[PDB]
Design an enzyme around this catalytic site. Structure first.
Site, mmCIF file in Angstrom:
data_model
loop_
_atom_site.group_PDB
_atom_site.id
_atom_site.type_symbol
_atom_site.label_atom_id
_atom_site.label_comp_id
_atom_site.label_asym_id
_atom_site.label_seq_id
_atom_site.Cartn_x
_atom_site.Cartn_y
_atom_site.Cartn_z
ATOM 1 N N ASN A 124 4.322 -7.305 20.772
ATOM 2 C CA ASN A 124 3.964 -5.952 21.175
ATOM 3 C C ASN A 124 3.775 -5.822 22.681
ATOM 4 O O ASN A 124 4.242 -4.851 23.275
ATOM 5 C CB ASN A 124 2.718 -5.499 20.422
ATOM 6 C CG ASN A 124 2.938 -5.470 18.928
ATOM 7 O OD1 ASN A 124 2.449 -6.330 18.196
ATOM 8 N ND2 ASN A 124 3.705 -4.489 18.468
ATOM 9 N N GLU B 79 0.830 -1.184 0.000
ATOM 10 C CA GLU B 79 0.000 0.000 0.000
ATOM 11 C C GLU B 79 0.874 1.246 0.000
ATOM 12 O O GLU B 79 1.985 1.230 0.542
ATOM 13 C CB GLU B 79 -0.948 0.039 1.207
ATOM 14 C CG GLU B 79 -0.307 0.376 2.541
ATOM 15 C CD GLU B 79 -1.324 0.520 3.647
ATOM 16 O OE1 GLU B 79 -2.504 0.179 3.419
ATOM 17 O OE2 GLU B 79 -0.950 1.005 4.733
ATOM 18 N N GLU C 250 29.723 -15.498 13.398
ATOM 19 C CA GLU C 250 29.725 -16.330 14.592
ATOM 20 C C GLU C 250 28.519 -16.104 15.491
ATOM 21 O O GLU C 250 28.461 -16.704 16.569
ATOM 22 C CB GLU C 250 30.996 -16.106 15.424
ATOM 23 C CG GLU C 250 31.325 -14.656 15.726
ATOM 24 C CD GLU C 250 32.558 -14.172 14.994
ATOM 25 O OE1 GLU C 250 32.766 -14.586 13.836
ATOM 26 O OE2 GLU C 250 33.321 -13.373 15.576
ATOM 27 N N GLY D 33 -0.747 -8.571 6.545
ATOM 28 C CA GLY D 33 -0.770 -8.733 5.107
ATOM 29 C C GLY D 33 0.601 -8.643 4.486
ATOM 30 O O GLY D 33 1.307 -9.650 4.414
ATOM 31 N N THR D 34 0.951 -7.449 3.995
ATOM 32 C CA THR D 34 2.186 -7.218 3.249
ATOM 33 C C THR D 34 3.430 -7.704 3.986
ATOM 34 O O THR D 34 4.385 -8.178 3.366
ATOM 35 C CB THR D 34 2.315 -5.724 2.941
ATOM 36 O OG1 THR D 34 2.718 -5.025 4.121
ATOM 37 C CG2 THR D 34 0.980 -5.162 2.523
ATOM 38 N N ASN E 296 9.511 1.171 18.912
ATOM 39 C CA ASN E 296 10.513 0.991 17.871
ATOM 40 C C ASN E 296 11.851 1.596 18.267
ATOM 41 O O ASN E 296 12.880 1.243 17.686
ATOM 42 C CB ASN E 296 10.008 1.588 16.559
ATOM 43 C CG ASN E 296 8.771 0.882 16.039
ATOM 44 O OD1 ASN E 296 8.382 -0.166 16.551
ATOM 45 N ND2 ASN E 296 8.123 1.476 15.049
ATOM 46 N N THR F 103 -4.462 -7.003 17.369
ATOM 47 C CA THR F 103 -5.178 -5.895 16.752
ATOM 48 C C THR F 103 -5.873 -6.304 15.454
ATOM 49 O O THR F 103 -6.533 -5.481 14.812
ATOM 50 C CB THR F 103 -4.217 -4.735 16.510
ATOM 51 O OG1 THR F 103 -4.951 -3.566 16.141
ATOM 52 C CG2 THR F 103 -3.278 -5.081 15.392
HETATM 53 N N1 LIG Z 1 6.350 -2.969 17.068
HETATM 54 C C1 LIG Z 1 5.492 -2.450 16.197
HETATM 55 N N2 LIG Z 1 4.481 -3.233 15.683
HETATM 56 C C2 LIG Z 1 3.598 -2.712 14.800
HETATM 57 C C3 LIG Z 1 3.707 -1.399 14.391
HETATM 58 N N3 LIG Z 1 2.713 -1.149 13.514
HETATM 59 C C4 LIG Z 1 1.987 -2.276 13.351
HETATM 60 N N4 LIG Z 1 2.523 -3.250 14.149
HETATM 61 C C5 LIG Z 1 2.071 -4.640 14.274
HETATM 62 O O1 LIG Z 1 1.945 -5.207 12.989
HETATM 63 C C6 LIG Z 1 0.968 -6.223 13.016
HETATM 64 C C7 LIG Z 1 0.201 -6.253 11.704
HETATM 65 O O2 LIG Z 1 1.010 -5.773 10.658
HETATM 66 P P1 LIG Z 1 0.701 -4.323 10.040
HETATM 67 O O3 LIG Z 1 1.954 -3.486 9.995
HETATM 68 O O4 LIG Z 1 -0.377 -3.650 10.853
HETATM 69 O O5 LIG Z 1 0.151 -4.604 8.557
HETATM 70 P P2 LIG Z 1 1.126 -5.205 7.433
HETATM 71 O O6 LIG Z 1 2.086 -6.216 8.013
HETATM 72 O O7 LIG Z 1 1.840 -4.086 6.740
HETATM 73 O O8 LIG Z 1 0.185 -5.876 6.330
HETATM 74 P P3 LIG Z 1 -1.247 -5.266 5.957
HETATM 75 O O9 LIG Z 1 -2.249 -5.912 6.873
HETATM 76 O O10 LIG Z 1 -1.584 -5.601 4.525
HETATM 77 O O11 LIG Z 1 -1.231 -3.773 6.154
HETATM 78 C C8 LIG Z 1 0.048 -5.895 14.172
HETATM 79 O O12 LIG Z 1 -0.058 -6.998 15.039
HETATM 80 C C9 LIG Z 1 0.698 -4.741 14.901
HETATM 81 O O13 LIG Z 1 0.801 -5.024 16.273
HETATM 82 C C10 LIG Z 1 4.724 -0.609 14.897
HETATM 83 O O14 LIG Z 1 4.812 0.561 14.539
HETATM 84 N N5 LIG Z 1 5.614 -1.133 15.807
#
Ligand SMILES: Nc1nc2c(ncn2[C@@H]2O[C@H](COP(=O)(O)OP(=O)(O)OP(=O)(O)O)[C@@H](O)[C@H]2O)c(=O)[nH]1
Ligand SMILES: Nc1nc2c(ncn2[C@@H]2O[C@H](COP(=O)(O)OP(=O)(O)O)[C@@H](O)[C@H]2O)c(=O)[nH]1
Ligand SMILES: Nc1nc2c(ncn2[C@@H]2O[C@H](COP(=O)(O)OP(=O)(O)O)[C@@H](O)[C@H]2O)c(=O)[nH]1
Ligand SMILES: [Mg+2]
Lengths: 428, 35, 22, 426, 66, 161, 426
Positions: free
Chosen positions: A197, A62, A245, A135-136, A219, A170
């Site tokens: 998380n 996206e 190593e 997803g991605t 992060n 989430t």
């Molecule tokens: N540590 C951390 N985890 C994140 C963050 N943003 C999203 N996540 C985690 O990423 C997981 C889902 O992946 P997303 O980044 O929301 O979505 P995606 O992996 O890009 O794939 P899509 O669903 O297609 O958007 C969720 O369980 C969130 O907890 C972040 O900024 N920091």
């Protein structure tokens, strides 16, 4: 010299890399226009008149998380061609990212990865920052890693995953695509450092005293973790640990390579001046059960190997004293095939602090990364979770729609079922 | 057609916009980052 | 095909910002 | 790119969508002539989702204003924000549907569907790729449900992999204008249940009394109902047009809510909502705002969830908020309302974080909730259907334009199938 | 004063000055994302890109003086 | 450079001190309004915090300078008689220049100075040698945590050198 | 922290709560608008016990204002310090109980208690952790006696472990307004004795006796009468909101005063109470403050404690004072008054020290006491109930709304068993 090409996929991987590439800029001082107002050649490539450019390829199907970093403060640092973007999001779906929407972007991502892997002599590893929660991150992460396996076979391929934490979730389809992505994480990855998380939720409230942090604060912690890990490659110090190593002292069998992590001097400056952060204090705070950034009580399962990345001003002898302190402790258990169970590294420059962050200055930090049998129930808790939705087959018509012959759920069922089955087979 | 300004403001619905706005400092933004 | 101004994220907008301002 | 084509189905969807293009214009800082201000270029940076460049610096909505009577088309263009639509987007019917499913879906649907599909073809094919089409319409009237869902049939058979998102209102339990309510609602559900990806319902009596005991407004017109739905109109599509921490799409909303492709009829809610005297006296934070949004008192669909179970839920938060008290509260409300949610799904709901709030607020939510408590309307409009259907009444006005007895018992058996699917999943 | 003390309930207080709506004061002066909340300091977002003083063929800054 | 000229900076009992009397100390401005409920709630915590810091030690560690966002001079003196630390007279345009430099305004924004991000009332903010911002104490911000963000102070690493 | 939810039942309940929140507000430095003034740190170190931040920099009381008739709080909202309350925390009635326990508890109290419970768990669960509830009412009226004790029985089910203390005012013998007095009294006590953790008994005629004989007030209005109750209202929650040398939480009082779980009815007094002529002649010392503490003319309940024995006692001191001049006066009243205290409890009494005094006064003590001399009031309502019940008088207003005769009889057996329980511990 050395370099480690970073590949971030998913919005979690992109935002993590927004903090990791944030912090690498300030460690060896490099301004956002590339310019500095031989150590930069671990994450940067000098080209022209001081134009240091990072070694990263952003990836998301996206255009929202990577268009936003194009318009942010790193339009000039992040050179605008490796920020690969698509149009339709994979929408929390493994059958979208690993399939129909995503082959259009694997072709261009492999092009820029091949350009970044054949422009500096002796590439050393691939740090992938993926997100198995959607997803991605999971779909394009699995397809891309399957192509790097044949394009570079001898190659070390450290990962950094955000596994679905137990109570915090989430998205409701996280249990499906987490099990579906174990096929990409069990035989196509050398190092599988595990993050989630809600453990970095707890690591910030009781230690940094922020009761409402954000994913920025999460992060920053992950950026501290990989900065200590790659501090020995970039910088100099006694008894260095290389990526070559790193897995040699943590991976006993080719299949069990799922590690964990803990930092140590994570204290805001108020109650950081009031404690003397000794070597024995930080290593026992590292081996503390509550300091793991995963829901993993490291007491229902015995440890197998440890990798204690000390850095800063630490002498190489009181490290041995504090390791002996941990060994004699009966609360930190070991298994019987390791009279020695520690490989420790030491850097010399202090763990950096971000100006405007939640951490303080310390010239010591233990980023211990450990391969224990207690990672098994992290996966096995997902086993009971996965079966409860698969019994009457909800959220399946999408997967069957764009791919997913019915039986990939069954082979990913038995792949992860054989995964923890190895774990209690090893430790007896 | 009962041309009273309160009646038209009611019937095109200014009232829910006013009732849905917040009557205090709602926009807050400081960049926490230092150079 | 729809074409918007240079201040919108649509198609190649990084190459449409510096030579012509809009 | 990322564009959504909008359809103004019926005059009920015309007044609802007129205030929808009200809230999206001033959220994007749009002059009614078509230009822009608002000191924040982020509004232009994703403007293509709902707008098109008019080759003169002007921006026009990607809306298809459609009806079988031109009286309300006069009122929309005479009203504010009515000159934004180009005149070619409007399509006119002259004879008027007589609150009649046969009058819209069959007879004068034949002379207008060939026109409205030409307009939406020149709109949707102007881009390289799109997500889908959102439709504002009614199930009480003949031109809002008959020829409204007639367009839903044609748009699905040419776009079979594009998302359908149908803002729809329903007949009411206690009040019923336009006396033939169930014959209009039922026969449009029989196509809305498989030609539409995501159906999500509004009750104007639930909007009458939300304006009563939560907003405290003395004399509710329809224009205050329009804007109250219009807040949740914007909140479901706000994460497409704005950046966020958890970015979400309508395909995210689809993939995460519906378990089984038959049942997709969701509930829509909005928060915060207080009176003038109660605006100052209430907190504004996530753990206090979630207690309002998890109420039957503020739900715009009047299906009481206390006698039902949430198969899935979703809350798209808006505004610059921290996220730990978001999703730790998601498990907090699930643990407290343990029996109110379904048991075979751990962590039923989604939480989304959008970064730009609606203007005039620090934060807000929209609540898309798949609930099996919605079946109480699907048995209410079914036994009210069989009231007139058994006695053969008010139906000679239909058979003379293309009906038969087969599709009426098929329509009854369709809700008998869908209700039985609802109650068996408890 | 300009009516803030008694919990000012309307944001029409910022629309008298942009009465012609084009006067370059309501034209693009804030960005409200969490990335500027978290990772942003003084002026390193709104800066132009230097390409060449010789045009499109110029890949850098050079000349016959070098 | 100079931040506060010769006649701008006056403490309690109206004795003007120059910039010379401020080194060695952790210096914050405090933008507050007399009639503001946030300020009225925050002020006793600030008083106790300031008293404990600047009473229990061998050096005067921290130091606060008041800036009024109020309406008039009587409101100034009624607020002013309650604080013991430094202050700037409202009618000095130095207050307005600090208001524009550190972005701490009160919704009168487009009529004079139509830029963007706002960082509203109240705001205690620690400063340095050339008038640069050091760290924001998050009372009403992205952390929005009131009456205890004063503890987020860093007196050892922020000094007026 | 440890929040106390406040509950106002009845016409007199709404007025005594009006006095409580206006002596707590100025104790904490709270303006009529809702802001703060006073610049003292101790007033704001713990204000969340009784207040809540409403994101406007201001504080809203955690009180629920309830009855069955809208003519009561329409005067307090226009009254001073009365606009402070949350406006939707008012849950009005419409019909109004006609001094009827039958109407308050069963008929119209059932359909209104659902909004009473809806507003109270919002204010209780909305914070981190709850201490308990505080309920002010009458047991002689219709609303504070009928639906007040229904709320008591209901909230105990959802919060079984939390503390619950009720300030209830009782009928007077020589002045009996609300002519059906003992029926509202006995049918409420018999269900308020097993559902309330501890109860404070106040009596109207003893309040008037304090005003005449001690304060020498010429014309005691209900405003001044509520003030005398409200001084001891704040003294029980003294160590909660304010620090002191010796702490006393609500459970600190409950544990030390209730040896056997059935009896928890407590006589309350407040010291000092000086007339406007004798304030400048009276020394304010701890020894004289402990004997005004122990006086029949300072007890707010008209049960002469010398008629029985002091089973347990406790005193909450306030202000800066020496702890030994507390402690020695705690002993010498036990040793001198040997006959007025129970023999089988060594150190019959408890003492605690607040550091913060009330407004103006240097030191003050509120007194709580479980004396067995309150039995005379329980036989007083016993024979007043029995005299009316042997003639079956005024029962057609009660049994005509769904109650059998046996409910009254088990109320007599339950309350007379309380009478015999106090008699066996003479
Ligand atoms: N540590 C951390 N985890 C994140 C963050 N943003 C999203 N996540 C985690 O990423 C997981 C889902 O992946 P997303 O980044 O929301 O979505 P995606 O992996 O890009 O794939 P899509 O669903 O297609 O958007 C969720 O369980 C969130 O907890 C972040 O900024 N920091
Ligand atoms: N938008 C709108 N809808 C209404 C109004 N009054 C009633 N409705 C709803 O609209 C339905 C009437 O059908 P409608 O679409 O207006 O008539 P149609 O021309 O036959 O399609 C009823 O079932 C009502 O629930 C109104 O004033 N505005
Ligand atoms: N302390 C006090 N008691 C009152 C007040 N007003 C009425 N009462 C008492 O309450 C009784 C009347 O019952 P009431 O509460 O008005 O009936 P309800 O409103 O139905 O609960 C009388 O016996 C009075 O003694 C007041 O203002 N203060
Ligand atoms: Mg994201």
């Amino acid at each position: 010299m050395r370099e480690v090409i970073s590949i971030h996929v998913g919005q979690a991987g992109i935002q993590i890399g927004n903090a990791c590439w944030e912090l690498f800029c300030l460690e060896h001082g490099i301004q956002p226009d590339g310019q500095m107002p031989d150590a930069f050649n671990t994450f940067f490539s000098e080209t022209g008149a001081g134009k240091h450019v990072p070694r990263c390829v952003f990836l998301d199907l996206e255009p929202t998380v990577v268009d936003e970093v194009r318009t942010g403060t790193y339009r000039h640092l992040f050179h605008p061609e490796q920020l690969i973007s698509g149009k339709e999001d994979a929408a929390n779906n493994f059958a979208r990212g690993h399939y129909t929407i995503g082959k259009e972007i694997v072709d261009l991502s492999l092009d820029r990865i091949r350009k970044l892997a054949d422009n500096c002599t002796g590439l050393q590893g691939f740090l992938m920052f993926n997100a198995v929660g959607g997803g991605t991150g999971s779909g394009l992460g699995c397809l891309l890693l399957e192509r790097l396996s044949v394009d570079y076979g001898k190659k070390s391929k450290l990962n950094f995953c955000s596994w679905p934490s137990p109570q915090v979730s989430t998205a409701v389809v996280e249990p499906y695509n987490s099990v579906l992505s174990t096929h990409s994480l069990l035989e196509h990855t050398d190092v599988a450092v595990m993050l989630d998380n809600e453990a970095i939720y707890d690591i910030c409230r009781r230690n940094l005293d922020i009761e409402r942090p954000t994913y920025t604060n999460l992060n920053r912690l992950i950026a501290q973790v990989i900065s200590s890990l790659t501090a020995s490659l970039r910088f100099d110090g006694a008894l260095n640990v290389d990526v070559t190593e790193f897995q040699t002292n943590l991976v006993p069998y080719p299949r069990i390579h799922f590690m964990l992590s803990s930092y140590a001097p994570i204290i805001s400056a108020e109650k950081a001046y009031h404690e003397q952060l000794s070597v024995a204090e930080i290593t026992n705070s590292a081996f503390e059960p509550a300091s793991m950034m995963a829901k993993c009580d490291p007491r229902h399962g015995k440890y197998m190997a440890c990798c204690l990345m000390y850095r800063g001003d630490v002498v190489p002898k009181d490290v041995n004293a504090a390791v002996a302190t941990i060994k004699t402790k009966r609360t930190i258990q070991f298994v019987d095939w390791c009279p020695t169970g520690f490989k420790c590294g030491i850097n010399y420059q202090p763990p950096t602090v971000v100006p405007g962050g939640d951490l303080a200055k310390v010239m010591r930090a233990v980023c211990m990364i450990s391969n224990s049998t207690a990672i098994a129930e992290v996966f096995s808790r997902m086993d009971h979770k996965f079966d409860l939705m698969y019994a009457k087959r909800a959220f399946v018509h999408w997967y069957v729609g764009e791919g997913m012959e019915e039986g990939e759920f069954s082979e990913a069922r038995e792949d992860l079922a054989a995964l923890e089955k190895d774990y209690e087979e090893v430790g007896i | 057609f009962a041309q009273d300004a309160t009646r038209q403001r009611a019937l095109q619905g200014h009232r829910t916009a006013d009732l849905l706005k917040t009557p205090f400092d709602y926009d807050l933004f400081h960049r926490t980052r230092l150079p | 095909m729809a074409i918007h101004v240079s201040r919108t994220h649509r198609e190649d907008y990084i190459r449409s910002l510096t030579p012509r301002p809009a | 790119m990322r564009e959504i084509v909008h359809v103004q189905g019926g005059q009920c969807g015309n007044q609802i969508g007129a205030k929808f293009w009200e809230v999206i214009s001033d959220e994007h800082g749009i002059d009614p002539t078509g230009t822009y201000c608002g000191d924040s270029d982020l509004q232009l940076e994703r403007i293509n989702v709902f707008y098109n460049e008019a080759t003169g610096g002007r921006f026009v909505p990607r809306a298809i204003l459609m009806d079988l009577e031109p009286g309300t088309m006069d009122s929309v263009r005479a009203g504010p924000f009515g000159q934004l639509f180009r005149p070619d987007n409007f399509v006119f019917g002259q004879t008027g549907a007589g609150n009649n499913w046969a009058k819209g879906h069959y007879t004068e649907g034949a002379e207008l569907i060939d026109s409205v599909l030409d307009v939406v073809r020149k709109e949707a094919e102007g881009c390289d790729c799109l997500q889908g089409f959102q439709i504002t319409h009614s199930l009480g009237g003949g031109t809002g449900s008959g020829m409204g869902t007639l367009l839903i049939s044609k748009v699905r058979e040419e776009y079979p992999d594009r998302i359908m998102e149908t803002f729809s209102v329903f007949p009411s339990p206690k009040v019923s204008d336009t006396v033939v309510e169930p014959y209009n609602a039922t026969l449009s559900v029989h196509q809305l249940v498989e030609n539409a990806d995501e159906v999500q319902v509004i009750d104007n009596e639930a909007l009458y009394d939300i304006c009563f005991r939560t907003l405290k407004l003395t004399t509710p017109t329809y224009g205050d109902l329009n804007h109250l739905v219009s807040a949740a109109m914007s909140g479901v599509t706000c994460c497409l047009r704005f950046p966020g921490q958890l970015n979400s799409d309508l395909r995210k909303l689809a993939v995460n809510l519906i378990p089984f492709p038959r049942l997709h009829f969701f509930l829509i809610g909005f928060a915060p909502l207080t009176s003038r005297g109660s605006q100052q006296y209430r907190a504004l934070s996530v753990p206090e705002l979630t207690q309002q949004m998890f109420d039957a008192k503020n739900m715009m669909c009047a299906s009481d969830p206390r006698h039902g179970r949430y198969l899935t839920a979703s809350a798209m938060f808006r505004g610059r908020m921290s996220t730990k008290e978001v999703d730790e509260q998601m498990l907090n409300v699930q643990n407290k309302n343990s029996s109110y949610f379904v048991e075979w799904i751990p962590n039923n709901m989604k939480s989304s974080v959008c970064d730009i709030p609606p203007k005039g607020l620090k934060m807000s939510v929209t609540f898309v909730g798949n609930s099996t408590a919605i079946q109480e309307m699907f048995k209410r409009v079914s036994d009210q259907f069989t009231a007139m259907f058994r006695r053969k009444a008010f139906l000679h006005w239909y058979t003379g334009e293309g009906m038969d007895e087969m599709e009426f018992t098929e329509a009854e058996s369709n809700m008998n199938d869908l209700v039985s699917e609802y109650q068996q999943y408890q | 004063n300009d009516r803030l003390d008694a919990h000012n309930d309307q944001k029409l207080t910022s629309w008298r000055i942009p009465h012609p709506l084009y006067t370059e004061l309501p034209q693009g002066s804030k960005y409200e994302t969490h990335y500027r909340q978290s990772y942003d300091y003084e002026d390193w977002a709104r800066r132009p890109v230097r390409l060449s003083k010789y045009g499109l063929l110029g890949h850098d800054d050079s000349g016959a003086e070098s | 450079l100079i931040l506060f000229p010769e006649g701008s900076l006056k403490n309690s009992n109206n004795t003007v001190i120059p910039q010379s009397h401020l080194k060695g100390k952790s210096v914050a401005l405090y933008f507050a309004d007399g009639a503001d409920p946030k300020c009225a709630s925050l002020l006793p915590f600030l008083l106790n915090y300031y008293r404990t810091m600047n009473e229990g030690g061998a050096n005067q560690k921290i130091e606060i300078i008041f800036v009024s966002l109020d309406r008039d001079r009587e409101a100034f003196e009624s607020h002013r008689a309650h604080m013991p630390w430094l202050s700037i007279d409202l009618e000095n345009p130095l207050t307005e220049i600090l208001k524009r430099h550190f972005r701490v305004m009160k919704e009168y924004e487009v009529p004079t100075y139509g830029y963007g991000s706002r960082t509203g009332v109240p705001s205690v903010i620690v400063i340095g040698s050339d008038g640069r911002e050091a760290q924001f104490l998050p009372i009403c911000s992205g952390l929005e945590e009131g009456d205890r963000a004063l503890l987020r102070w860093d007196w050892r690493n922020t000094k007026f050198a």
